[PDB]
Write an enzyme that holds these catalytic residues in place. Sequence first.
Site, short mmCIF file in Angstrom:
data_model
loop_
_atom_site.label_atom_id
_atom_site.label_comp_id
_atom_site.label_asym_id
_atom_site.label_seq_id
_atom_site.Cartn_x
_atom_site.Cartn_y
_atom_site.Cartn_z
N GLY A 43 29.70 -23.99 6.83
CA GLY A 43 29.67 -25.17 5.89
C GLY A 43 28.61 -26.09 6.78
O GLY A 43 28.77 -26.04 7.96
N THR A 44 27.60 -26.87 6.12
CA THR A 44 26.82 -27.74 6.89
C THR A 44 26.02 -28.59 5.82
O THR A 44 26.52 -28.60 4.47
CB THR A 44 25.65 -26.72 7.45
OG1 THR A 44 24.60 -27.74 8.21
CG2 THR A 44 24.77 -25.88 6.37
N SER A 51 17.31 -24.61 4.98
CA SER A 51 16.57 -24.02 6.08
C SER A 51 17.20 -22.87 6.62
O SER A 51 16.18 -21.71 6.88
CB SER A 51 16.79 -25.17 7.32
OG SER A 51 16.08 -24.79 8.62
N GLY A 56 16.11 -19.10 7.71
CA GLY A 56 16.88 -18.11 8.52
C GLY A 56 17.62 -19.06 9.58
O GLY A 56 16.88 -20.09 9.79
N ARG A 58 18.26 -20.51 13.23
CA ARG A 58 17.39 -20.85 14.24
C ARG A 58 18.02 -21.71 15.24
O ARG A 58 18.22 -22.77 14.94
CB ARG A 58 15.98 -21.26 13.92
CG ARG A 58 14.76 -20.26 13.61
CD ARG A 58 13.39 -20.68 13.37
NE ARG A 58 12.27 -19.98 13.06
CZ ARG A 58 12.26 -19.17 12.44
NH1 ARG A 58 13.21 -18.83 11.59
NH2 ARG A 58 11.14 -18.18 12.61
N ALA A 59 18.21 -21.12 16.59
CA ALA A 59 18.78 -22.23 17.38
C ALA A 59 17.70 -23.28 17.79
O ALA A 59 16.63 -22.87 17.59
CB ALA A 59 19.11 -21.32 18.83
N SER A 61 18.25 -26.33 20.70
CA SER A 61 18.49 -26.75 22.04
C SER A 61 19.84 -26.79 22.49
O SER A 61 20.86 -26.22 21.91
CB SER A 61 17.70 -27.96 22.21
OG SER A 61 18.38 -29.01 21.61
N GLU A 155 38.30 -19.52 13.84
CA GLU A 155 37.06 -19.43 13.69
C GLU A 155 36.09 -18.52 14.39
O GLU A 155 36.54 -18.03 15.47
CB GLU A 155 36.66 -20.89 14.30
CG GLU A 155 37.28 -21.21 15.73
CD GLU A 155 36.83 -22.49 16.38
OE1 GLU A 155 36.47 -23.61 15.52
OE2 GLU A 155 36.39 -22.57 17.64
C1 LIG Z 1 28.17 -31.10 11.89
N1 LIG Z 1 28.98 -31.48 12.87
C2 LIG Z 1 30.42 -31.05 12.74
C3 LIG Z 1 28.80 -31.27 14.35
C4 LIG Z 1 28.94 -29.92 14.93
O1 LIG Z 1 28.46 -29.90 16.17
N2 LIG Z 1 29.42 -28.80 14.31
C5 LIG Z 1 29.43 -27.91 13.10
C6 LIG Z 1 28.40 -27.85 12.39
C7 LIG Z 1 28.64 -26.97 11.09
C8 LIG Z 1 29.75 -26.07 11.00
N3 LIG Z 1 29.99 -25.48 9.97
C9 LIG Z 1 31.04 -24.26 9.77
O2 LIG Z 1 31.07 -23.66 8.92
C10 LIG Z 1 32.08 -24.30 10.86
C11 LIG Z 1 33.06 -23.14 10.62
C12 LIG Z 1 34.31 -23.19 11.71
C13 LIG Z 1 34.17 -24.07 12.94
C14 LIG Z 1 32.99 -24.95 12.88
C15 LIG Z 1 32.08 -25.05 11.84
C16 LIG Z 1 30.85 -25.96 12.12
C17 LIG Z 1 30.55 -26.94 13.19
#
Ligand SMILES: CN(C)CC(=O)Nc1ccc2[nH]c(=O)c3ccccc3c2c1
EC number: 2.4.2.36
Length: 204
Positions: A43-44, A51, A56, A58-59, A61, A155
Amino acid sequence: EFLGDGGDVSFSTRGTQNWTVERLLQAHRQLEERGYVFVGYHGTFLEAAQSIVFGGVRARSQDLDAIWRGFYIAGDPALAYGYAQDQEPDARGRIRNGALLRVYVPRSSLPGFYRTSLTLAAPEAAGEVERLIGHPLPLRLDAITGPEEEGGRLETILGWPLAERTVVIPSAIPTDPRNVGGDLDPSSIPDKEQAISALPDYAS
Ligand SMILES: CN(C)CC(=O)Nc1ccc2[nH]c(=O)c3ccccc3c2c1
């Protein structure tokens, strides 16, 4: 292009454009045929989804520590869903809903997947994971699955080297623009998507 066919795919607060559970199914079958296997949801926020899918993974930093740096995903879409949204508001206080993504990795990468019953947030988890993976963190072209700090949900963390080898496509599970921050409504999960969501067996 592992997105199957139909029109241009676009992420948006109104829902992923030109993405239906049926198109996902075509995409999924193509990936499997190419030797790829589903390892979980990610999830994002919208732009990071865009992106990730077309550019694809991409790390970017953070090398000082960030020992557990990597790409975080989850077998259970409910865990990943909590993260499918903006992390901070804009100048007007708006926090947009994001999107759920399906992560695939070449089957040839599966040997690097490990799982432990130890909660990853635990202090001694790093030492146990390093033993399991055969080297010091951060994760490399490998991954570890373990209980979230608190909640019981598993996770999965993909070492950036592995993550950058993934093929990621949109999920047919939508985020709710009317309920940002809310928990995933399991009834919003298409049966057809739940059907193609079995995970590979990991090493323990
Ligand atoms: C975007 N914020 C939550 C800041 C961060 O550093 N983390 C982040 C950002 C996106 C993330 N997306 C996931 O699907 C997920 C699934 C299991 C555990 C964590 C994540 C996850 C974690």
